[PDB]
A paper describes a structure:
Previous work has demonstrated that one particular kinase, known as cyclic guanosine-3′,5′-monophosphate (cGMP)-dependent protein kinase, or protein kinase G (PKG), has essential roles in multiple stages of the parasite life cycle. Selective pharmacological inhibition of Plasmodium falciparum PKG (PfPKG) blocks the egress of merozoites and gametes from erythrocytes, as well as inhibits the motility of ookinetes in the mosquito and invasion of hepatocytes by sporozoites. The cellular functions of parasite PKG are regulated by allosteric and cooperative binding of cGMP, similarly to how mammalian PKG is activated. In contrast, PKG enzymes of Plasmodium and other apicomplexan parasites have an extended N-terminal domain that features four CNBs upstream of the KD and are monomeric, resulting in an effective regulatory stoichiometry of 4:1.
Here, we describe the complete atomic structure of PKG from two human malaria parasite species, P. falciparum and Plasmodium vivax. In the Plasmodium PKG crystal structures, each protomer in the dimers can be described as four CNBs, which, together with the N lobe of the KD, form a pentagonal arrangement, with the KD C lobe locked in the center. CNB-A and -B make direct contact with and constrain (and are constrained by) the C lobe of the KD from functionally essential movement, resulting in a substructure of these three domains that closely resembles the R-C heterodimer of PKA. Interestingly, all three Plasmodium structures display a swapped domain arrangement, in which the N terminus of each protomer in the dimer interacts with the active site of the other. Similar to PKA, the KD of PfPKG adopts a classical bilobal structure flanked by an N-terminal helix (αAK) and a C terminus. Despite being locked in an overall autoinhibited state, PfPKG–KD surprisingly exhibits many structural features of an active kinase, including: (i) interaction between the catalytic lysine K570 and E589 (on helix αCK); (ii) positioning of the helix αCK toward the ATP-binding site; (iii) an open (active) conformation of the activation loop; and (iv) intact hydrophobic spines. ΑAK in PfPKG makes multiple contacts with the N and the C lobes, some of which involve R809 as well as the C terminus of PfPKG–KD, and none of which have been observed in PKA. The contact between the two termini features a salt bridge between R528 and D597 as well as a π-bond between H524 and R809. In site 1, the basic AIS in PfPKG is docked against the activation loop of the KD in a manner reported for PKA, with key lysines (K15 and K16) replacing homologous arginines (R94 and R95 in PKAR–RIa) in interacting with the P+1 loop on the KD. The third CNB, pCNB-C, stands out because a hydrophobic network consisting of Y363, H373, F371, and F359 occludes the cGMP-binding pocket.
Author numbering: 15 to 20, 23 to 110, 112 to 549, 552 to 824, 850 to 853
The structure:
């Protein structure tokens, strides 16, 4: 017995196939398409070469009088431009009538949507047409290939060599394509240059003092200096044939990157310090400090920069430009070029005399690091204390339980650690006893043994015994010293509980208990339904009496919608999330008919109901909720996740009034530029709509939409609009205004900078990342440490609980 095969070959797409005819395009055809697309909502930002390519994908369609083109209520896919004849319209089976030059079905280019009108042909007329799939696919291909071409051209430009991978990708998105006709001047001699040009196609002639010097082709570039200095152009460059250039202006580069020269030297110094066996062990913040504080100096060629015994405060040097030679008395040790460095032994032993000599081999630039520079940046006169301090800090800043404590709290915790020794065979912890110490291995190896079964071996910088800080319980496993000379850092529970305060302790006490509880489906009892894909049940775990949420999703509903890859990806993202303001997944389950997600139960209600109870937010209330979202979003962007559906509906409050981001169905791990149109229209960024690619920046746009809601009340774009097209039009072209009762300069500026249409110029989307938002004057009185450390009073704490109402899982 064999199954038959069976739909979707009888829509409006199949109707257009019947009317399709072949037609070679004339000059009258292309020009007529170019004009209609340039006036259209999606294509008005596009250049001529993109519009020309799109214009070639237009198909020709022929209609006799009485033939239906579009019917009302049918799902729409094509966009049309009337080539000849008249076409009547029926608004609710009744309105307009339009002929050559006009267009319709614009919304179809963006999204699959029901047709408003129904257009019948009045006379023997013809249409130019294109389908959504082809249109979006074409924009995707134009943008992707443009970016990749421009990226490999950036790699050939030597002034950008010391940019990082992320920084090069950033400046690639700052490239503007510029097309030039034959005989057109690209740059003129004596003009003050602020633009770097790279030839993509064509040829240009270089003239100096009216004399023909040379010809530039694909891959040639000029104006490197124009990105650094403000000087006269050295030559006049005129296009010889039709020519395309990628250009980057200094103005946009300074927005994207800041001072290019500063960034390059910072990167050289930062990479040099990361090769040092001493400077390796310090944090990125400390290395950026050393880089930003180092004395930078130029020296001439064949110059003794440092000479045995005559050196005073200088302990370390990094070559930024040129070359120097390192000597010990008369013996040559080596040549240091860009990014190489010297002085480890003098950094470690700052009182010992300088015995080396550094002589320049050519004109050079050097970064000098002194005793004062080290003390100020590494925060101590003693270097071994600093190293020791940061070794502990690095380890605890990775752990959930310590990393959201404040800098004061974290510093008190680090100072409290003491050292103890153990020999081969010693039990550091014995299974059974009630523990009270947390351990970090400084030197040696230890075995973890649970119920006589070796679980794993831990070594230098691993940690154990964490739960004893939160709970008074018996120890679940023993920890035995593998070898002699084992040394641990340790801190006692009692000190941790002095440092930490009530709210944060309760958060950790609840979270770790529920996380670590091994839960089976046998052991759960449904209490009530709290959400209607599938259902969300408030469940109760009988052995521990801990309460959870259990989201159930129909396995048959997933197969029928081809969400098999998407549910795997949702699980993967939802599982990795470990942040206090993001919902925490405990476990997943699988059976014959369902996929289950078991999460923490969130009891404080929805954010969308909190803001309606509070009304328009005060500055501190808006700071609190926006700040919370910022930290959650920042967490995700650090892991290359774009959330894509940020809105108050997807944010719950916990018992304490702190927020939890939920619903990761729209989230994606970004690998390059994303193109699929996903989200809630009122919150969707313009770069999602326009279809030329996007990444993590879309969440920062939505953040500005949310802030506007909080302070002003209504949505900034499309507030009183149901129809999706008109919402999108307002997002793309509408004027951003504020009510008469919103006047706070810092609130207005932040909303304006967050709702910048160009993602490249949007606050938070430059080199400093979220730091620019966090340091914005709007947050000037806001303590980010206290937010994450649960030390702020929230705007709203609820009196009771409120709720709405193959595969490896």
């Amino acid at each position: 017995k064999k199954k038959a095969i069976f739909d979707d070959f009888t829509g409006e797409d199949s109707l257009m196939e019947d009317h399709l005819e072949l037609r070679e395009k004339l000059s009258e055809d292309i020009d007529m398409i170019k004009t209609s697309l340039k006036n259209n909502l999606v294509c008005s930002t596009l250049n001529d070469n993109e519009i020309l390519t799109l214009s070639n994908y237009m198909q020709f369609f022929v209609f006799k009088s009485g033939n239906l083109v579009i019917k009302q209520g049918e799902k729409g896919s094509y966009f049309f431009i009337i080539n000849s004849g008249k076409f009547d319209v029926y608004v609710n089976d009744k309105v307009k009538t339009m002929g050559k030059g006009s267009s319709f079905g614009e919304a179809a280019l963006i999204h699959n949507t029901q047709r408003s009108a129904t257009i019948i042909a009045e006379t023997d007329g013809t249409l130019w047409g294109v389908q959504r799939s082809t249109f979006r696919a074409t924009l995707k291909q134009l943008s992707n290939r443009n970016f990749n071409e421009n990226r490999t051209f950036i790699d050939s430009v030597s002034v950008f060599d010391m940019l990082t991978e992320a920084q090069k990708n950033m400046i690639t998105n700052a490239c503007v394509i510029q097309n030039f006709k034959s005989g057109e001047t690209i740059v003129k001699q004596g003009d003050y240059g602020d633009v770097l040009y790279i030839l993509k196609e064509g040829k240009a002639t270089v003239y100096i003092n009216d004399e023909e010097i040379r010809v530039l082709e694909k891959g040639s570039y000029f104006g490197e200096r124009a990105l650094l200095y403000d000087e006269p152009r050295s030559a006049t460059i005129i296009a010889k044939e039709p020519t395309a250039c990628a250009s980057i202006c200094r103005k946009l580069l300074n927005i994207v990157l800041g001072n290019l020269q500063v960034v390059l030297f910072r990167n050289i110094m930062t990479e040099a310090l990361q090769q040092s066996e001493i400077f390796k062990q310090f944090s990125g913040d400390q290395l950026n400090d050393l880089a930003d504080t180092a004395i930078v100096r130029d020296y001439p060629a064949n110059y003794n920069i440092l000479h045995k015994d005559k050196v005073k405060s200088v302990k370390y040097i990094i070559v930024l430009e040129g070359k120097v030679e390192l000597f010990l008395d008369d013996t040559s040790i080596g040549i240091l070029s860009r990014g190489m460095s010297f002085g480890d032994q003098y950094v470690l032993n700052q009182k010992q005399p300088f015995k080396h000599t550094i002589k320049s081999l050519e004109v050079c630039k050097i970064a000098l690091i002194t005793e004062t520079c080290l003390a100020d940046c590494l925060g101590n006169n003693n270097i071994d204390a600093s190293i020791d301090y940061n070794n502990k800090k690095s380890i605890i800043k990775k752990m959930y339980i310590f990393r959201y404590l404040t800098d004061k709290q974290c510093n008190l915790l680090i100072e409290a650690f003491r050292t103890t020794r153990y020999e081969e065979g010693d039990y550091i912890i014995q299974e059974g006893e009630v523990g009270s110490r947390f351990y970090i291995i400084k030197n040696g190896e230890v075995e973890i043994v649970k119920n006589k079964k070796r679980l794993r071996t831990l070594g230098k910088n691993d940690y154990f015994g964490e739960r004893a800080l939160l709970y008074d319980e018996p120890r679940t496993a023993s920890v035995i010293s593998k070898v002699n000379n084992v040394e641990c850092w340790f801190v006692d529970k009692s000190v941790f509980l002095q440092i930490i305060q009530g709210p944060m302790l309760a958060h950790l006490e609840e979270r770790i208990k529920m996380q670590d509880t091994k839960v089976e489906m046998d052991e759960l009892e449904t209490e009530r339904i709290i959400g209607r894909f599938g259902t969300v049940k408030l469940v109760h775990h009988k052995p521990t009496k801990i309460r959870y949420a259990l989201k159930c999703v129909s396995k048959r509903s997933i197969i029928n919608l081809n969400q098999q890859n998407n549910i795997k990806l949702e699980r993967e993202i939802t599982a990795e999330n470990d942040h206090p303001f993001i919902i925490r997944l405990v476990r997943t389950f699988k059976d014959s008919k369902y996929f289950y997600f078991l999460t923490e139960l969130v009891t404080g209600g929805e954010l969308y109901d909190a803001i309606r109870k509070l009304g328009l937010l005060s500055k501190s209330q808006a700071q609190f909720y926006l700040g919370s979202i910022i930290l959650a979003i920042e967490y995700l962007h650090e892991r290359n996740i774009v959330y894509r559906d940020l809105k108050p509906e997807n944010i719950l409050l916990d018992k304490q009034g702190y927020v939890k981001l939920i619903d990761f169905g729209c989230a994606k791990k970004v690998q390059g530029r994303a193109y699929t149109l996903v989200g809630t229209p009122h919150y969707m960024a313009p770069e999602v709509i326009l279809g030329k690619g996007y990444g993590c920046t879309v969440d920062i746009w939505a953040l500005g939409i949310c802030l506007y809601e909080f302070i002003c009340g209504p949505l900034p774009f499309g507030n009183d609009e149901e129809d999706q097209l008109e919402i999108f039009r307002d997002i793309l072209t509408g004027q951003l205004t504020f009510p008469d009762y919103v006047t706070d300069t810092d609130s207005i500026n932040l909303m304006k900078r967050l709702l910048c249409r160009l993602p490249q110029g949007r606050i938070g989307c430059s080199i400093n990342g979220f730091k620019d938002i966090k340091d914005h004057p709007f947050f000037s009185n806001f303590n980010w440490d206290k937010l994450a450390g649960r030390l702020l009073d929230p705007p709203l704490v609820s009196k009771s609980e409120t709720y709405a109402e193959d595969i490896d899982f």
